[PDB]
Amino acid sequence: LVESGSAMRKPGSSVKISCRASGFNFREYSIHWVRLIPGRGLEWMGWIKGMWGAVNYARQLQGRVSMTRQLSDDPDWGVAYLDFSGLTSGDTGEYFCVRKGPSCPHCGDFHWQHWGQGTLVVVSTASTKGPSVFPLAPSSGGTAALGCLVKDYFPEPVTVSWNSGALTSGVHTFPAVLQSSGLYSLSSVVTVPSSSLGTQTYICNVNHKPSNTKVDKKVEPK
Amino acid sequence: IVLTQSPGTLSVSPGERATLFCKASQGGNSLSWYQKRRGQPPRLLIYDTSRRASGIPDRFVGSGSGTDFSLTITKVDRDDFALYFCQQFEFFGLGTALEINRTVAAPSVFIFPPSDEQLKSGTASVVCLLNNFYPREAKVQWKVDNALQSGNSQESVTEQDSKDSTYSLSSTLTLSKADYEKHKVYACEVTHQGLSSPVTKSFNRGE
Amino acid sequence: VWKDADTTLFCASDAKAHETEVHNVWATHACVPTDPNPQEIHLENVTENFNMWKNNMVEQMQEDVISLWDQSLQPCVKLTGGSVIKQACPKISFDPIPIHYCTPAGYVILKCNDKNFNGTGPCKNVSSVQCTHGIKPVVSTQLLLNGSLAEEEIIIRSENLTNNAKTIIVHLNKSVEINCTRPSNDIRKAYCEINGTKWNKVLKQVTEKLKEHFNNKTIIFQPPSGGDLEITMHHFNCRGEFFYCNTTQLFNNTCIGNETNGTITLPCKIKQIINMWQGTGQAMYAPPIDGKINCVSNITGILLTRDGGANSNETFRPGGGNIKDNWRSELYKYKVVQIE
Ligand SMILES: *[C@@H]1O[C@H](CO[C@@H]2O[C@@H](C)[C@@H](O)[C@@H](O)[C@@H]2O)[C@@H](O[C@@H]2O[C@H](CO)[C@@H](O)[C@H](O)[C@H]2NC(C)=O)[C@H](O)[C@H]1NC(C)=O
Ligand SMILES: *[C@@H]1O[C@H](CO)[C@@H](O)[C@H](O)[C@H]1NC(C)=O
Ligand SMILES: *[C@@H]1O[C@H](CO)[C@@H](O)[C@H](O)[C@H]1NC(C)=O
Ligand SMILES: *[C@@H]1O[C@H](CO)[C@@H](O)[C@H](O)[C@H]1NC(C)=O
Ligand SMILES: *[C@@H]1O[C@H](CO)[C@@H](O)[C@H](O)[C@H]1NC(C)=O
Ligand SMILES: *[C@@H]1O[C@H](CO)[C@@H](O)[C@H](O)[C@H]1NC(C)=O
Ligand SMILES: *[C@@H]1O[C@H](CO)[C@@H](O)[C@H](O)[C@H]1NC(C)=O
């Protein structure tokens, strides 16, 4: 099951996610769509038969979802589609297309063994913006830490490497948090011996691909 | 139909036996089990109460009847520590997370004053580190001139670093430039459990 | 003493050699003349488990009806995904005839004489018969036509009601006629008359029998949420013409005791370009024939799929599609076993 790449939308918009199907009789099996909304658990949205395309949408997503089937003798071929209108802020998460994998006939129509690679969708009022870098200068007795503060950027992700590589010891790149401004921010610290200050150079490399922003930030003690 | 997964988080040593629950509201049916490791899509383990799928070790043992169900892992592997969901048709559980248990670890609390380059943006952010600790139950307070903050700081804790199964966390206190220049002392009280005294790292405005 | 087994059955009917009708042409060579004196031995103090959703008799009948349509109904051009099959498409008389299924030497069909039996549980009052009763192989969606009514009260049939991915079969206790009509001179415009005064009276009984299986909550009906035209509207074949009837004001109901102008009419259209239920793709037929096309059928069953999610109300939408479920509406009380 192959879906489209990651997509980001504005609130009140719509998103079309495809789901390539092969290696199984599509007309006899179903394709369910399940989204993983963070801290809320897996949510089943609906399934789609390949025969006549009967659909069963979840009640709490009416007038927002619509699933269409595509087909083509090697039958198996075809693509499933998920349309998600009425985008809010709480619809951000991983959206999977799931299907009962090649196994037993006893397996019900909800025992999904096969899962797609997943489609990440982020919906907010924010726009693409390069990150700002603030150095976290180490304090002033034995093994102190230093790091970089990646604040105000959108969207995910950001890759942080130290000294252009060759420095992957005690490095902690924390997961991003969503501020009230609607922009992400995270920290990336590195623990370092207090005797190696002033003699060793410490440089962090913050990269932001979606806004084509690259930053080589240096950190000096106080 | 309500699927209640308890306890939500379980600390198990690599080799011990884990036991998850899935007490449903309406019985007379079966239950499935799904495993999800971070970075990879959820995987089916058990379907129809107690039946394994293709390419699944026998250490995963399912059982239960009526409303009470249970997933048991005989001798937990180091790759079994993940998020587990149970399913009845369309309904799921909130999920339980298998945790690597270890001895307690005192966090090394560090504090970082906002850069002068940052102050030119009109805002100021001071952060705490307290990296490498166990378990992930910490309490950062943020006190500026003996004044407690509540609603202007965000923390971010990393998952267990497999090389020692420890945490980190990072609380960031963000303020404006005007409010930052008004005060002097910026503290960071940390109440874990390692050492009976709450470790506090602070700095005064200037240097 | 017997065991659940499976074998190749032979069909039986009353096909007439003089008839040029499709089903009569098929059933005169593929079937045998109906036995004039069928015997039936009633047996008590004997129980037996049935399962219509795992019945081999259905798959055989399915394989016979699909052969009936591949033998006669030849469209003008037929698409094979990328290639075309252009043949001749002459009009023909289309009217399904009762077809009985019997067992060869060594096998016997068991019949469940239990009145309110749905098709999954055990039967206490079971009889043995050589052949099945008159079953009309009518291909239709949403509404079941020309079938058998319930023995006494409405029977709810489903593989599993708790599963929303399984179609539901309703066994009506009282029938409702449909007066479908394609007047001759506006040529595409068709009709479908249903007595609305007795429809909301028979549809409420369906809900109340369904409300017993759902913790005393209200039940609402609505048109299907999507799919091809063969499933989104009332699809059935009459007089060789493929009808497509919109049933919006038909499933425009809510349930307490009962809830829902002239009697309810269903706007229908005739499409020459249809999707075959043989599963080979889309085909195009010859344009409709002149004259008054009238198809008086009987509503005896409804095919539903429970709209499920995170609910206190249950929503039921029409839509069968799989015609294998249509045969199960009648072959529910039949099962082939092997003698000793
Ligand atoms: C969770 O684990 C702790 C620690 O056990 C240890 O650390 C592991 C990495 C492994 O190396 C074991 O061999 C270690 O023993 C358990 O700690 C117990 O704590 C009590 C009181 O502090 C002490 O008296 C016991 O000796 C400790 N256990 C052992 C085996 O020495 C703790 O019980 C575990 N809890 C759970 C729920 O698993
Ligand atoms: C069907 O429902 C029955 C109870 O109504 C239950 O025992 C059975 O496990 C269900 N089957 C499936 C495949 O869900
Ligand atoms: C069993 O069914 C037969 C015919 O269906 C009927 O004549 C008979 O009375 C039934 N048995 C009982 C005990 O009612
Ligand atoms: C059919 O009737 C049996 C009674 O033996 C019952 O157990 C089963 O749940 C019923 N199934 C449906 C779908 O009503
Ligand atoms: C049936 O008619 C209604 C109007 O009452 C329309 O909204 C609906 O789309 C139609 N369904 C079809 C054509 O399948
Ligand atoms: C039921 O019919 C009314 C008008 O008769 C219509 O407004 C409404 O949309 C219908 N309900 C549906 C189609 O679910
Ligand atoms: C049902 O039977 C009647 C009378 O036998 C017939 O007129 C009608 O065409 C049949 N229905 C279908 C869909 O053929």
CA dist list (Å): C304 to A56, B103, C151, C213, C321:
11, 58, 21, 15, 10
Buried b (16+ CB within 10 A) or exposed e, A113-148: bbbbebbbbbbbebeebbbbbbbbbbbeeeebbbbb
Q: How far apart are CA B178 and CA B82, in angstroms?
A: 45
CB atoms within 10 A of CB A35: 22
Question: Could you tell me if the CB of C146 is within 6 A of ligand 7?
Answer: yes
Q: Please tell me if residue A52 touches chain C, with a CB cutoff of 8 Å.
A: yes
Q: Do A109 and C165 touch (CB under 8 A)?
A: yes
Going by DSSP bridges, is the β-strand pair A132-136/A144-153 parallel, antiparallel, or unpaired? antiparallel
Q: CA-based diameter of chain C, in Å?
A: 63
CA separation for the pair C164, B92 (Å, rounded): 15
**8 A C-beta contact, residue C26 and residue C11:** no
Render the burial of C164-197: b for 16+ CB within 10 Å, e for the rest.
bbbbbbbbbbebbebebbbeeeeeeebbbbbebe
Question: Residue A74 belongs to what domain range?
Answer: 1-125
Minimum-distance CB partner of C163 among A44, A49, A109: A109
User: Which atom in ligand 5 lies closest to the alpha carbon of residue C248?
Assistant: 1
Q: What are the residues whose beta carbons fall under 8 Å from the beta carbon of C160, sequence distance 6 or more? A: C166
Cis peptide before A155 (omega within 30 of 0): yes
Structure-token pair, residue C140:
């239709």
**C112 alpha carbon – ligand 7 mean position (Å):** 27
Same domain (yes/no): A133, A202:
yes
d(CA C323, CA C136): 13
C-alpha A221: how far from chain center:
35
DSSP C287: P
- CB–CB contact A54 C163 (8 Å): no
For residues A135 and A113, what is the distance between their CA atoms, to the nearest angstrom?
46
Residue corresponding to tokens 């000096």: A220
Same domain, A114 and A134: no
Total number of domains in chain A: 2
Nearest residue on chain B to C311, alpha-carbon basis: B1
Measured between alpha carbons, how far is A107 from C28 in angstroms, rounded to an integer?
41
Q: ω before B7 within 30° of 0 (cis)?
A: yes
Regarding the beta carbon of B103 and ligand 1, being less than 6 Å apart is answered yes
Q: If you search the block for the tokens 């590195």, which residue do you land on?
A: A190
* Lookup: tokens for A9: 């939308």
Place of tokens 């709209």: C307
Q: Based on the domain organization, do A11 and A119 belong to the same domain?
A: yes
Q: Which two tokens stand for residue B131?
A: 């990296």
For residue C316, give the 3-state DSSP assignment: strand
Report residue B115 as tokens.
């850069």
How far apart are the CA of B89 and the nearest CA of chain C, in angstroms?
7
Listed residue (C338, C314, C339) closest to C6, CA to CA: C338
Decide: residue C47, CB within 10 A, 0-12 exposed, 13-18 middle, 19+ buried: exposed
CATH number of B1-102: 2.60.40.10
Between CA B192 and CA B104 the distance in angstroms is 10
Ligand 7 site, residue C145, Cβ cutoff 6 A: yes
Q: Which of A159, A164, A170 shows the shortest CA–CA distance to A203?
A: A164
Q: What is the Cα–Cα distance from A132 to A142, expressed in whole angstroms?
A: 30
Handedness of CA C123, C125, C129, C134 (dihedral sign): negative
Of the candidates C194, C195, C192, C220, which has an alpha carbon nearest to the alpha carbon of residue C206? C220
Q: What is the DSSP track for chain B?
A: --EE-SSSEEEE-TTS-EEEE-EESS-SS--EEEEE-TTS--EEEEETTTEE-TT--TTEEEEEETTEEEEEESS--TT--SEEEEEETTEE---EEEEE----B--B--EEPPPHHHHTTTEEEEEE--BS-BSS---B--EESS-B--SSEEE-PPPPBTTTTB----EEEEEEHHHHTT--EEE-EE--SSSSS-EE--EES--
Resolution of the model in angstroms: 3.4
Q: Distance (Å, rounded) from C-alpha B118 to C-alpha B121? A: 6
Amino acid C283 reads A
Q: What are phi and psi of B21, to 5 degrees?
A: -120, 160
3-state secondary structure B35-47: EECCCCCCEEEEE
Cα–Cα distance list, C240 to A24, C95, C136 (Å) = 34, 8, 16
Q: Which of A68, A96, A125 is the last residue of a domain?
A: A125
- The 3-state DSSP class for residue A46 equals strand
Cα–chain center distance at C76: 27
Domain boundaries, chain B: 1-102, 103-206
Instruction: Please tell me which chains touch B, using 3 or more CB pairs under 8 Å as the contact test.
Output: A, C
Which of A125, A160, A176 is the last residue in one of the domains? A125
Pairing of strands A41-49, A30-37: antiparallel
DSSP run (H or E) holding C42: strand C40-43
Residues paired with B23 in a beta bridge: B4
Residue C268: nearest ligand to its CA? 5
Query: Which residue in the set A96, A139, A222 is minimally distant from B111, CB to CB?
Result: A139
Beta partners for A96? A34
CA distances from C217 to A55, A182, C140, C254 (A): 23, 42, 30, 12
Q: Output b/e per residue, B186-198; b: 16+ Cβ within 10 A.
A: bbbbbebeeeeee
Same domain, A34 and A110: yes
Pull the structure tokens for residue B95. Answer: 């999920």
A59 contacts C81? CB cut-off 8 A? no
Q: Do A58 and B125 touch (CB under 8 A)?
A: no
Instruction: Identify from A35, A48, A55, A99 which residue to disrupt to test chain C contact, counting C C-beta atoms within 10 A and taking the largest count.
Output: A55
- The atom number, within ligand 2, closest to the CA of C163 reads 14
Indicate whether A34 and A142 sit together in one domain.
Answer: no
Do A27 and A135 fall within a single domain?
no
Rg (CA), chain C: 21
C193 within 8 A of C178, measured Cβ to Cβ: yes
Q: Which ligand is nearest to the CA of B19?
A: 1
Residue A198 burial (CB count, 10 A): 8
Q: Tell me if C337 sits within 8 A of C6, measured CB to CB.
A: no
Residues, chain A: 222
Cα–Cα distance, A204 to A195 (Å, whole number): 20
Per the rule left: phi > 0, alpha: psi between -120 and 50, beta: everything else, A61 is alpha
Say whether both A155 and A72 belong to one domain. no
The CATH number for A90's domain is 2.60.40.10
Element (H, E) at C177: strand C168-182
Whole-angstrom Cα distance, residue B96 to residue B23?
13
In a shared domain, residues A2 and A101: yes
Instruction: Tell me the C-alpha to C-alpha distance, in Å, between residue C32 and each of A42, C14, C26, C60.
Output: 56, 8, 11, 16
Verify whether the Cβ–Cβ distance C315 to A47 is below 8 Å: no
**B1-102 matches B103-206 in fold:** yes
- CATH architecture of the domain formed by B103-206: Sandwich (2.60)
**Which of A94, A109, A125 represents a domain boundary (last residue)?**
A125
Method by which the coordinates were obtained: X-ray
| Tokens at C199, concatenated | 């429809």
**Can you tell me whether residue C65 is helix, strand or coil?**
helix
* CB neighbour list of residue C149: distance below 8 Å, 6 or more residues apart: C171, C172, C173, C174, C175, C300
**Which residues on neighbouring strands pair with residue B74, listed in sequence order?**
none
Q: How far is CA B140 from CA B107, B148, C95, in A?
A: 12, 10, 81
Give the number of other CB atoms < 10 A from CB of residue C67: 13
Handedness of CA A105, A108, A109, A115 (dihedral sign): negative
Distance from chain centroid for Cα C102: 20
Residue C121 DSSP label: S
Residue C295, class by beta-carbon neighbours within 10 Å (0-12 exposed, 13-18 middle, 19+ buried)?
buried
> What contacts C212, CB < 8 A, 6 or more positions away?
none
> Which token pair is A91?
């619809």
Q: Residue type at A113?
A: Q
Domains of chain C plus CATH, in order, are: 1-340 (2.170.40.20)
Instruction: Please indicate, yes or no, whether residues A117 and A24 belong to a single structural domain of this protein.
Output: yes
DSSP state of C297: E
Ligand 3: atom nearest CA of C42 is: 3
With left for phi above 0 and alpha for psi between -120 and 50, is residue B89 left, alpha or beta?
left
**Residue A29 DSSP symbol:** S
**Peptide bond between residue C75 and the one before it cis (omega within 30 degrees of 0):** no
Ligand 5 neighbour C225 (Cβ under 6 A): no
Give the integer Cα–Cα distance in Å for C10 and C90: 30
Tell me if B36 sits within 8 A of A98, measured CB to CB.
Answer: no
CA distance A54 to chain B (A): 17
Q: Which chain B residues are Cβ-neighbours of C309 within 8 angstroms?
A: 90
Q: Which residue has the tokens 């998952």?
A: B159
Q: Are residues A15 and A100 in the same domain?
A: yes
Q: On the CB side of C164, how many CA atoms lie within 13 Å of its CA?
A: 26
Closest Cβ opposite residue B168 in set A41, A107, A174: A174
C325 touches chain A (CB under 8 A): no
Q: Which of A56, A57, A50 is nearest to A72 (CA)?
A: A50
